[PDB]
């Protein structure tokens, strides 16, 4: 050793040692003992930097990441009218009042109408179902209240629908716990999707050796495994694939189990064959070639995805507290009932310089469609006025930090909208900028105007499909309106 | 003959004759004498339908088209700090006050602050420079005032800057008339670009045998030829190409003149060669192949385009009437000074069920960037709240119809923005819809993840370029903000 410092080799922060003599040699000591002489800050260094001696933000995101990754790493190992709608409405109609009642001991009325607090209630609920403190937004100010998780758990287990209350198909093995878990998976998918706005999972994909572009395949990666086990398709295909790659290196039987699950999630035949084409007895290359091809295909043709469309938690609690009934509602088919609750209740939110109103509106939008990876155009039409670029967002999290301060104002959600479930003859194939100097154009259209067999087909099919602009309808109570899904999303500007 | 009716064969309305006998034979009589027994309604049929006996809309658009096409057909035949900035500001600073004064005889003060009326003033001015009635918006209601065009012409010719007033390069042949015409071309490009929102020119391209997709190459086609002659590049390359095709069929010398102009408008070498490759001595095919290739290339790499960035006409008149000076302003380099005037003046507009506020905002946006073919993202950021889809627009024209009624309210233009003149490392290459069922994706990226030589190169270059998302900055006084040009524009939903 001779000289010590802190640096960022890749996207992590490491200890850099320079020794001079036969000139200068550079070492990155992974000892992390040393730390005195000196995005991801890591545990030992964050404990030493917090104990003794931008720095606070990249560490809040870092420990957050640690939690996300632990939850994801639970889920990757575990890889080895409609009933569901009626059950989910029954579940909500029975559980939410019990949540209203429990938290009336702890929170005021106005407090439960604050967006952050609904989120907080579900997170603590999920925690109990698996005495802690709980960070609550007050009069712009953050208070820490105490929640007894046994009371919360017991209240939940008794309040929730019974096995006989649910509609189950004939000879169903489904139990009370089982269905509860399905509902919690559907609801946790919505609540947690706002976090993936702030930390999509890029780091995790990179750390597992997947191209960052495959992050869009990691929706809901942090849904608590007890719930996802029952509702695998709430989870996003990247979980299974990473499980398959990890077990490819390292037993044989598991690989077949995950493979079968992935095959079932495929919605085109091309992906099904491609999936089966992966074999535990292949070289590193050409298994990676197949895996990569498969991943890429999944960007073209998404895996089978399950989810629900519910209004904000607080809104939902208010709407039920006001006397309204959700038993006859359908949150599976589309977002209509979710929008009806949205327009009706008078949700409130805490906002500030970093977590602005347009940020909050984006967080709502994202939970309504239960995915951070949704088209930005859709997001914008779903909750008007929301922010369409992640880059313009200055906050680093949805969660109040206890030193946090807000101004509590109204989160009006009339003019909210949902996408019609589907069941473009335009001539305009390019635009210019303001100067008429630069053009953006539809590649597929421009091209028309002018194992290996698999790849060729997929590539042709892709181009054949990208040539036509994709349109979709946003539905209000006043009617229905076409928009174009451009392909731009959140995260489209880095970073 | 046996039976007669009206029908729409292609996109025009024709007279359909059925004769039955040896069964039934169908004829489309082009006589148009006959009309009693019975989108483009045509003259003789519109005169007969108006004189004797949805119908009114498709005919307002039809006669409008006739005017557009006549003006375009003048321009296609005629195909055979900075000075310009300072001259344009001088021109405006001297001409606009004279317009304020002239129209004070005819209009009230409040009337001149109405958007429609500024448009009307320039159109009549252009007319005079080439006693009529003039349709004016009043108190929501439309009045017809009388304008004496000789007075208007004389006032203009005397008020406008003199040859010595302008900055001209050494040994310039430029005259007073000459420069006036350059300025009128720049200003008419802005004022008239709102019409191309309503009638882009699809019909004209189709009628000349060009693919409708090439409509984006027809910006400013209806700019009065006396002005465009001096400022060809305000006009859009389709004018020259159509001239070249028309003369290809039909003298030799003209073809070379237009060819030279087109060659000069090219900004890539590929287009220059391609342009020169067109020869009057080629077969129908393979001249069309080259022409088409050239047209397509122009969608990828726009021709040289000139234009100015000015605020709405009325705004401009008000700002000058209020005492402010534009002599030191630059409307060529970008839209900064235009936005400064926008924020300052208190423009008003007449609006109604069809011509709504969001429609009016779109009409303003389009004139600010002086093109109907600009990116929708840009339009939306340029004048917030404007309508991003032509399809959602119910009006058929910017012009009050004399039977028209409005509610006159304020057209606030703070928060307006301009695109920084340029001098994306994102991992997100696809989005999903709300259901996670359908994906939209970047073709170029997906492909990377997985005479004839010319064509091949162009096609490769296209794909190479479309792979990376294009970003640009919108500038406010509070700062600068990145957006992505998605490729979606106005007209992206048909029809």
Author numbering:
A (entry chain A), B (entry chain A): 5 to 25, 27 to 38, 41 to 45, 61 to 75, 86 to 112, 133 to 182, 201 to 320, 325 to 497, ...
Manuscript excerpt for this entry:
The genome of orthomyxoviruses consists of multiple segments of negative-sense, single-stranded RNA molecules, each packaged in the form of rod-shaped, double-helical ribonucleoprotein (RNP) complexes. Our study of a fish orthomyxovirus, the infectious salmon anemia virus (ISAV), shows that its nucleoprotein (NP), which forms the protein scaffold backbone of the viral RNP, has a bi-lobular structure like the influenza virus NP. Each RNP contains a viral RNA, a heterotrimeric viral polymerase (consisting of PA, PB1, and PB2) and multiple copies of the viral-encoded nucleoprotein (NP) that bind viral RNA in a stoichiometric manner. Our results indicate that each ISAV-NP binds ∼12-nt RNA, shorter than the 24–28 nts originally estimated for the influenza A virus based on population average.
The final model contains 495 amino acid residues in total, including residues 5–25, 27–38, 41–45, 61–75, 86–112, 133–182, 201–320, 325–497, 504–530, and 542–586. Each NP molecule can be divided into three domains: an N-terminal domain, a head domain, and a body domain. The tail loop of ISAV-NP (residues 504–530) folds into an extended β-hairpin that protrudes into a deep pocket in a neighboring subunit to mediate dimer formation. Analogous to the influenza A virus NP, there is a potential RNA-binding groove between the head and body domains of the ISAV-NP.
